[PDB]
Tab-separated table of C-alpha atoms and ligand atoms in Angstrom:
chain	number	residue	atom	x	y	z
F	833	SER	CA	0.000	0.000	0.000
F	834	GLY	CA	2.078	2.887	-1.397
F	835	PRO	CA	5.875	3.334	-1.701
F	836	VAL	CA	8.184	2.610	1.300
F	837	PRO	CA	9.676	5.874	2.779
F	838	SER	CA	13.458	6.641	2.575
F	839	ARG	CA	15.874	9.190	4.110
F	840	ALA	CA	19.453	10.374	3.402
F	841	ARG	CA	22.247	8.474	5.246
F	842	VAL	CA	24.202	11.767	5.801
F	843	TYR	CA	23.151	15.377	6.623
F	844	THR	CA	19.593	14.058	7.195
F	845	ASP	CA	18.402	16.924	9.474
F	846	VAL	CA	20.779	19.812	8.554
F	847	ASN	CA	17.844	21.939	7.302
F	848	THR	CA	15.532	20.859	10.195
F	849	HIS	CA	18.101	22.213	12.748
F	850	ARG	CA	18.254	25.616	10.856
F	851	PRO	CA	15.727	28.560	11.072
F	852	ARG	CA	13.210	28.808	8.163
F	853	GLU	CA	15.102	31.896	6.767
F	854	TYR	CA	17.801	29.457	5.452
F	855	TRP	CA	15.617	27.031	3.459
F	856	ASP	CA	12.341	29.015	2.928
F	857	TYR	CA	13.306	30.526	-0.442
F	858	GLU	CA	9.690	31.556	-1.243
F	859	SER	CA	10.004	34.125	1.656
F	860	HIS	CA	13.543	35.300	0.627
F	861	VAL	CA	13.680	38.958	-0.481
F	862	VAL	CA	15.862	39.414	-3.562
F	863	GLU	CA	17.467	42.851	-4.037
F	864	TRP	CA	17.975	43.489	-7.767
F	865	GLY	CA	20.794	46.006	-8.354
F	866	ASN	CA	21.290	48.170	-11.455
F	867	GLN	CA	22.590	46.327	-14.567
F	868	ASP	CA	24.182	49.676	-15.806
F	869	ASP	CA	27.333	48.652	-13.801
F	870	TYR	CA	27.849	45.807	-16.311
F	871	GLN	CA	28.662	46.226	-20.018
F	872	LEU	CA	27.799	43.139	-22.111
F	873	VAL	CA	30.758	42.054	-24.358
F	874	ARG	CA	29.869	38.736	-26.092
F	875	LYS	CA	27.271	35.957	-26.074
F	876	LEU	CA	28.695	32.727	-24.574
F	877	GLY	CA	25.541	30.781	-25.499
F	878	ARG	CA	21.744	30.209	-25.303
F	879	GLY	CA	19.853	27.655	-23.223
F	880	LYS	CA	16.660	26.414	-21.575
F	881	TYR	CA	15.799	29.013	-18.825
F	882	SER	CA	18.653	31.434	-19.816
F	883	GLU	CA	21.007	33.474	-22.124
F	884	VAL	CA	24.692	33.631	-20.988
F	885	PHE	CA	27.011	36.603	-21.712
F	886	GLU	CA	30.594	37.604	-21.003
F	887	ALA	CA	30.577	41.093	-19.463
F	888	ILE	CA	32.724	43.766	-17.883
F	889	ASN	CA	32.089	45.372	-14.457
F	890	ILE	CA	32.365	49.187	-15.087
F	891	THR	CA	33.273	49.744	-11.362
F	892	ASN	CA	36.481	47.562	-11.226
F	893	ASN	CA	37.303	46.581	-14.905
F	894	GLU	CA	36.887	42.841	-14.105
F	895	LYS	CA	35.371	40.268	-16.473
F	896	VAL	CA	32.197	38.540	-15.243
F	897	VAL	CA	29.552	36.238	-16.648
F	898	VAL	CA	25.930	37.614	-16.895
F	899	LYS	CA	23.129	34.998	-17.065
F	900	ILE	CA	19.895	36.704	-18.254
F	901	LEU	CA	16.966	34.513	-17.094
F	902	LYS	CA	13.663	33.957	-18.967
F	903	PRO	CA	11.241	34.796	-16.027
F	904	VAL	CA	9.186	31.584	-16.398
F	905	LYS	CA	8.706	30.802	-12.619
F	906	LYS	CA	9.254	33.381	-9.791
F	907	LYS	CA	9.665	30.687	-7.034
F	908	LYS	CA	12.360	28.988	-9.224
F	909	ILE	CA	14.381	32.250	-9.563
F	910	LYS	CA	14.064	32.777	-5.737
F	911	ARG	CA	15.216	29.161	-5.181
F	912	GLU	CA	18.330	29.465	-7.415
F	913	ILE	CA	19.236	32.855	-5.821
F	914	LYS	CA	18.736	31.632	-2.211
F	915	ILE	CA	20.825	28.493	-2.845
F	916	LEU	CA	23.601	30.537	-4.574
F	917	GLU	CA	23.728	33.020	-1.684
F	918	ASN	CA	23.738	30.134	0.887
F	919	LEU	CA	26.629	28.390	-0.901
F	920	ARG	CA	28.510	31.623	-1.866
F	921	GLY	CA	32.207	31.118	-1.282
F	922	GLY	CA	32.019	27.301	-0.830
F	923	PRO	CA	34.845	25.109	-2.299
F	924	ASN	CA	34.477	24.853	-6.125
F	925	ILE	CA	30.969	26.425	-6.033
F	926	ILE	CA	30.362	29.120	-8.671
F	927	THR	CA	30.392	32.593	-7.006
F	928	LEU	CA	27.269	34.720	-7.509
F	929	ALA	CA	28.956	38.182	-7.730
F	930	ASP	CA	25.702	40.188	-8.140
F	931	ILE	CA	21.946	40.127	-8.886
F	932	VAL	CA	20.867	42.829	-11.415
F	933	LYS	CA	18.031	43.995	-13.702
F	934	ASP	CA	18.505	46.210	-16.809
F	935	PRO	CA	16.510	49.466	-16.192
F	936	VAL	CA	14.365	49.230	-19.391
F	937	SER	CA	13.854	45.403	-19.737
F	938	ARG	CA	13.569	44.572	-15.945
F	939	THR	CA	14.769	41.058	-16.966
F	940	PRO	CA	16.179	39.032	-14.025
F	941	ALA	CA	19.959	38.623	-14.419
F	942	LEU	CA	22.576	36.806	-12.336
F	943	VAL	CA	26.232	37.890	-12.330
F	944	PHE	CA	28.904	35.189	-11.796
F	945	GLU	CA	32.735	34.999	-11.472
F	946	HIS	CA	34.338	34.578	-14.902
F	947	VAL	CA	35.769	31.054	-15.484
F	948	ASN	CA	37.948	30.509	-18.549
F	949	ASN	CA	36.297	27.209	-19.568
F	950	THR	CA	37.944	24.400	-21.532
F	951	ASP	CA	35.240	22.631	-23.652
F	952	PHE	CA	34.715	19.037	-22.328
F	953	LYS	CA	35.072	17.613	-25.917
F	954	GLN	CA	38.589	19.202	-26.205
F	955	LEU	CA	39.570	18.265	-22.580
F	956	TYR	CA	38.310	14.657	-23.333
F	957	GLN	CA	41.414	13.916	-25.494
F	958	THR	CA	44.133	15.479	-23.256
F	959	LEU	CA	42.925	14.151	-19.794
F	960	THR	CA	45.349	11.790	-17.932
F	961	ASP	CA	44.499	9.154	-15.217
F	962	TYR	CA	45.746	11.745	-12.627
F	963	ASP	CA	43.617	14.567	-14.200
F	964	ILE	CA	40.407	12.480	-13.837
F	965	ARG	CA	41.226	11.589	-10.158
F	966	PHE	CA	42.058	15.277	-9.403
F	967	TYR	CA	38.921	16.790	-11.039
F	968	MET	CA	36.661	14.030	-9.528
F	969	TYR	CA	38.034	14.985	-6.064
F	970	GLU	CA	37.279	18.710	-6.797
F	971	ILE	CA	33.630	17.947	-7.733
F	972	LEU	CA	33.511	15.836	-4.509
F	973	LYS	CA	34.708	18.912	-2.502
F	974	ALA	CA	31.799	20.867	-4.135
F	975	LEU	CA	29.278	18.013	-3.499
F	976	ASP	CA	30.223	17.193	0.124
F	977	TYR	CA	30.024	20.950	0.849
F	978	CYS	CA	26.602	21.585	-0.816
F	979	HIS	CA	25.178	18.327	0.716
F	980	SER	CA	26.449	19.474	4.243
F	981	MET	CA	24.543	22.736	3.498
F	982	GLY	CA	21.333	20.699	2.976
F	983	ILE	CA	21.374	21.172	-0.792
F	984	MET	CA	21.105	18.580	-3.571
F	985	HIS	CA	22.339	19.928	-7.006
F	986	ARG	CA	20.069	17.599	-9.094
F	987	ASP	CA	21.801	18.509	-12.443
F	988	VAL	CA	25.394	17.156	-12.183
F	989	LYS	CA	26.721	16.709	-15.778
F	990	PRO	CA	29.789	17.863	-17.878
F	991	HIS	CA	28.196	21.191	-19.081
F	992	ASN	CA	27.641	22.145	-15.398
F	993	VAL	CA	31.350	21.432	-14.523
F	994	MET	CA	33.467	24.477	-15.654
F	995	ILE	CA	37.200	23.652	-15.785
F	996	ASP	CA	40.052	26.170	-16.360
F	997	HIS	CA	42.571	23.342	-17.097
F	998	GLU	CA	45.562	25.785	-17.439
F	999	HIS	CA	44.989	26.961	-13.818
F	1000	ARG	CA	43.554	23.524	-12.663
F	1001	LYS	CA	40.379	25.325	-11.374
F	1002	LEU	CA	36.924	23.638	-11.247
F	1003	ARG	CA	33.454	25.227	-10.573
F	1004	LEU	CA	30.086	23.497	-10.180
F	1005	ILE	CA	27.596	25.787	-12.038
F	1006	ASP	CA	23.840	26.114	-12.756
F	1007	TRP	CA	22.024	25.687	-9.481
F	1008	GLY	CA	18.684	26.329	-11.265
F	1009	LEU	CA	17.554	22.729	-10.576
F	1010	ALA	CA	18.944	22.560	-6.986
F	1011	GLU	CA	16.745	21.913	-3.931
F	1012	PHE	CA	16.802	21.901	-0.168
F	1013	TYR	CA	16.802	18.404	1.318
F	1014	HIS	CA	14.058	17.846	3.896
F	1015	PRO	CA	13.734	14.286	5.313
F	1016	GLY	CA	10.528	12.621	4.035
F	1017	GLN	CA	9.828	15.333	1.388
F	1018	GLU	CA	8.464	14.180	-1.989
F	1019	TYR	CA	10.251	15.869	-4.871
F	1020	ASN	CA	9.545	16.395	-8.585
F	1021	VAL	CA	11.258	13.577	-10.561
F	1022	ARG	CA	11.497	15.796	-13.722
F	1023	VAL	CA	15.056	16.907	-12.753
F	1024	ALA	CA	18.631	16.270	-14.225
F	1025	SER	CA	19.630	15.715	-17.894
F	1026	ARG	CA	18.375	12.350	-19.320
F	1027	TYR	CA	21.837	10.643	-19.367
F	1028	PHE	CA	22.547	11.487	-15.695
F	1029	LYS	CA	18.993	10.790	-14.349
F	1030	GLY	CA	18.959	8.401	-11.383
F	1031	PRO	CA	16.889	5.157	-11.443
F	1032	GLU	CA	14.757	6.775	-8.670
F	1033	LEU	CA	13.685	9.523	-11.146
F	1034	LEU	CA	13.056	7.056	-13.991
F	1035	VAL	CA	10.877	4.770	-11.753
F	1036	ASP	CA	9.061	7.876	-10.285
F	1037	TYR	CA	10.254	7.430	-6.638
F	1038	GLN	CA	9.772	10.973	-5.222
F	1039	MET	CA	11.422	10.556	-1.742
F	1040	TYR	CA	15.004	10.878	-3.081
F	1041	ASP	CA	18.020	12.776	-1.581
F	1042	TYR	CA	21.752	13.894	-2.086
F	1043	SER	CA	22.438	10.337	-3.371
F	1044	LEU	CA	20.906	11.420	-6.759
F	1045	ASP	CA	24.037	13.600	-7.379
F	1046	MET	CA	26.186	10.507	-6.510
F	1047	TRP	CA	24.500	8.574	-9.394
F	1048	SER	CA	25.172	11.501	-11.856
F	1049	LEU	CA	28.838	11.707	-10.713
F	1050	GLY	CA	29.089	7.933	-11.452
F	1051	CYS	CA	27.681	8.506	-15.015
F	1052	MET	CA	30.331	11.263	-15.478
F	1053	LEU	CA	33.165	9.067	-14.132
F	1054	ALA	CA	32.051	6.116	-16.382
F	1055	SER	CA	32.156	8.374	-19.447
F	1056	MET	CA	35.650	9.723	-18.503
F	1057	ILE	CA	37.521	6.459	-17.630
F	1058	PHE	CA	35.969	4.506	-20.569
F	1059	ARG	CA	35.989	7.402	-23.114
F	1060	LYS	CA	32.246	6.757	-23.863
F	1061	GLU	CA	30.176	10.014	-23.741
F	1062	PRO	CA	27.388	9.518	-22.575
F	1063	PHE	CA	27.916	6.177	-20.763
F	1064	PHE	CA	24.167	5.447	-20.602
F	1065	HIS	CA	22.753	6.615	-23.946
F	1066	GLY	CA	18.949	6.811	-23.528
F	1067	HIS	CA	16.767	8.105	-26.373
F	1068	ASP	CA	13.937	9.010	-23.904
F	1069	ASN	CA	13.263	8.754	-20.120
F	1070	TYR	CA	11.795	5.206	-20.379
F	1071	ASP	CA	14.629	4.008	-22.689
F	1072	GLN	CA	17.108	5.610	-20.216
F	1073	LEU	CA	16.170	2.969	-17.597
F	1074	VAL	CA	16.557	0.178	-20.245
F	1075	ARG	CA	20.144	1.418	-20.999
F	1076	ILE	CA	20.950	1.255	-17.247
F	1077	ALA	CA	19.304	-2.255	-17.055
F	1078	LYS	CA	21.496	-3.341	-20.026
F	1079	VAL	CA	24.590	-2.785	-17.739
F	1080	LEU	CA	23.306	-3.223	-14.128
F	1081	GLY	CA	20.935	-6.108	-15.058
F	1082	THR	CA	17.147	-6.534	-14.526
F	1083	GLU	CA	17.495	-8.744	-11.348
F	1084	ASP	CA	18.872	-5.839	-9.190
F	1085	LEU	CA	16.274	-3.462	-10.762
F	1086	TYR	CA	13.312	-5.613	-9.576
F	1087	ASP	CA	15.060	-5.972	-6.153
F	1088	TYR	CA	15.119	-2.107	-5.962
F	1089	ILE	CA	11.443	-1.553	-6.981
F	1090	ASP	CA	10.507	-4.311	-4.410
F	1091	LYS	CA	12.648	-2.942	-1.492
F	1092	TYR	CA	10.767	0.388	-1.912
F	1093	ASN	CA	7.381	-1.071	-3.152
F	1094	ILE	CA	7.462	1.107	-6.333
F	1095	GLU	CA	4.663	0.679	-8.913
F	1096	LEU	CA	6.574	0.319	-12.240
F	1097	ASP	CA	4.994	2.355	-15.103
F	1098	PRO	CA	3.176	0.173	-17.741
F	1099	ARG	CA	5.233	1.899	-20.534
F	1100	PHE	CA	8.269	-0.168	-19.266
F	1101	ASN	CA	6.463	-3.519	-19.968
F	1102	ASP	CA	7.344	-3.896	-23.712
F	1103	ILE	CA	10.883	-2.299	-23.618
F	1104	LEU	CA	12.630	-3.454	-20.389
F	1105	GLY	CA	13.217	-7.136	-21.261
F	1106	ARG	CA	15.677	-9.386	-19.363
F	1107	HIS	CA	19.371	-8.473	-18.856
F	1108	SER	CA	22.334	-10.090	-17.062
F	1109	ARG	CA	24.482	-8.027	-14.639
F	1110	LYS	CA	27.538	-6.884	-16.670
F	1111	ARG	CA	31.105	-6.795	-15.277
F	1112	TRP	CA	32.732	-3.302	-15.436
F	1113	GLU	CA	35.887	-4.849	-17.071
F	1114	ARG	CA	33.853	-5.466	-20.327
F	1115	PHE	CA	34.085	-1.657	-20.997
F	1116	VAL	CA	37.944	-1.682	-21.003
F	1117	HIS	CA	39.416	-1.241	-24.524
F	1118	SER	CA	42.739	-0.190	-26.174
F	1119	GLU	CA	41.629	3.495	-26.297
F	1120	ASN	CA	40.815	3.775	-22.535
F	1121	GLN	CA	42.893	1.112	-20.630
F	1122	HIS	CA	45.493	3.809	-19.551
F	1123	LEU	CA	42.640	5.557	-17.538
F	1124	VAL	CA	41.151	2.359	-16.019
F	1125	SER	CA	42.466	0.659	-12.833
F	1126	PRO	CA	41.088	-1.871	-10.227
F	1127	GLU	CA	40.607	1.124	-7.810
F	1128	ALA	CA	38.648	3.131	-10.513
F	1129	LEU	CA	36.350	0.121	-11.208
F	1130	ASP	CA	35.790	-0.502	-7.467
F	1131	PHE	CA	34.878	3.208	-6.952
F	1132	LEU	CA	32.580	3.266	-10.067
F	1133	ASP	CA	30.788	0.064	-8.866
F	1134	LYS	CA	30.110	1.796	-5.516
F	1135	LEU	CA	28.458	4.875	-7.248
F	1136	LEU	CA	26.384	3.345	-10.093
F	1137	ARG	CA	23.850	1.315	-7.996
F	1138	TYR	CA	19.984	1.219	-8.337
F	1139	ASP	CA	19.495	1.543	-4.593
F	1140	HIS	CA	20.119	5.210	-3.754
F	1141	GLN	CA	20.761	4.227	-0.082
F	1142	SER	CA	23.544	1.767	-1.180
F	1143	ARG	CA	25.581	4.462	-3.105
F	1144	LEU	CA	28.712	6.029	-1.493
F	1145	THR	CA	28.083	9.471	0.038
F	1146	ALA	CA	30.419	12.326	-1.183
F	1147	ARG	CA	32.452	11.987	2.098
F	1148	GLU	CA	32.796	8.129	1.861
F	1149	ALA	CA	33.764	8.624	-1.834
F	1150	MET	CA	36.542	11.087	-0.832
F	1151	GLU	CA	38.123	8.285	1.340
F	1152	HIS	CA	38.177	5.730	-1.558
F	1153	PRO	CA	41.677	4.410	-2.594
F	1154	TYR	CA	41.052	5.888	-6.099
F	1155	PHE	CA	41.955	9.309	-4.504
F	1156	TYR	CA	45.142	8.270	-2.585
F	1157	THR	CA	47.362	9.866	-5.321
F	1158	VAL	CA	45.620	13.306	-4.970
X	158	N5Q	O1	24.240	29.011	-14.450
X	158	N5Q	C1	25.329	29.228	-13.949
X	158	N5Q	O2	25.527	29.217	-12.670
X	158	N5Q	C2	26.513	29.673	-14.752
X	158	N5Q	C3	27.695	30.086	-14.132
X	158	N5Q	C4	28.813	30.418	-14.878
X	158	N5Q	C5	28.776	30.346	-16.268
X	158	N5Q	N1	29.991	30.551	-16.965
X	158	N5Q	C6	30.302	30.356	-18.271
X	158	N5Q	N2	29.432	29.901	-19.141
X	158	N5Q	C7	30.046	29.718	-20.381
X	158	N5Q	C8	29.270	29.150	-21.498
X	158	N5Q	C9	29.920	28.608	-22.616
X	158	N5Q	C10	29.210	28.009	-23.617
X	158	N5Q	C11	27.796	27.924	-23.562
X	158	N5Q	C12	27.020	27.320	-24.586
X	158	N5Q	C13	25.654	27.264	-24.490
X	158	N5Q	C14	25.001	27.801	-23.386
X	158	N5Q	C15	25.712	28.398	-22.377
X	158	N5Q	C16	27.128	28.477	-22.435
X	158	N5Q	C17	27.899	29.087	-21.415
X	158	N5Q	C18	31.364	30.046	-20.409
X	158	N5Q	S1	31.909	30.614	-18.882
X	158	N5Q	C19	27.595	29.979	-16.910
X	158	N5Q	C20	26.471	29.650	-16.165
X	158	N5Q	O3	25.363	29.256	-16.853
């Protein structure tokens, strides 16, 4: 009778033991400064929810990034702002430098520290075994910090990991999908990019936590060590679960939906099939073997698991032998 409840294994009550001001973003008062202090230089790109520009602060001659938001949902803008302010200054967390509105357009805009990004497709070729271990540890610094702050990112993926390889600097960006973790809260499963979506989202299990970001990090590690981007290549949300099942096997999937008494969607009936549990060593090839190690495979195996409770937390992950060299 209904799905079995679940709670995070770490930082369970960090928001409960904090006054409402911290996590009640709908009550947070945003002060929008004047955009006249920033001169737009070039368009960095377009996206869902936003337009990103390189700009110059007229008050100190420093380069910044200006993200002009399509004001689609007021609560969502308040959430992103509140989270950014809460995390401001945290290790490898993008720094929200300002919050501005152009006088004539009144369009919500966020101002961020400029990061001289190295495109993931160009970095992909020049990354060493050490580089992967180093950058994974840096994202873990970001994750353990934001999780300790009662925040789950919910959109961990390569585009949201800005790397200035020359200066060996990493920043976890786009907190537009982030949420405050409250034990027993039922969340929207329509979060993360398809390839990085956790089995919990795909099976419509709403009581998820920080462990969702641990799945995504696994998907990113699996694509890096094996040189296979994306590792799980779903063509839709239902097919995404089939791609996971093709690696993790259907036995452990049914074990997961049974441990939590999840009602599997009828759209999964004709596509899921039957799949054996694959060994991680099957993904080792001539092109990637110099990035793979027993330690890397042991760490990967501990992240990519159906059961969100069974996945390593960011802190446990930081103690894994895969990071002894960093
Ligand atoms: O949301 C955030 O917190 C956030 C923080 C910093 C930041 N910095 C930067 N972005 C880019 C960039 C480059 C190529 C692109 C292609 C399509 C679309 C967008 C794109 C953005 C370069 S440096 C961007 C952000 O979106």
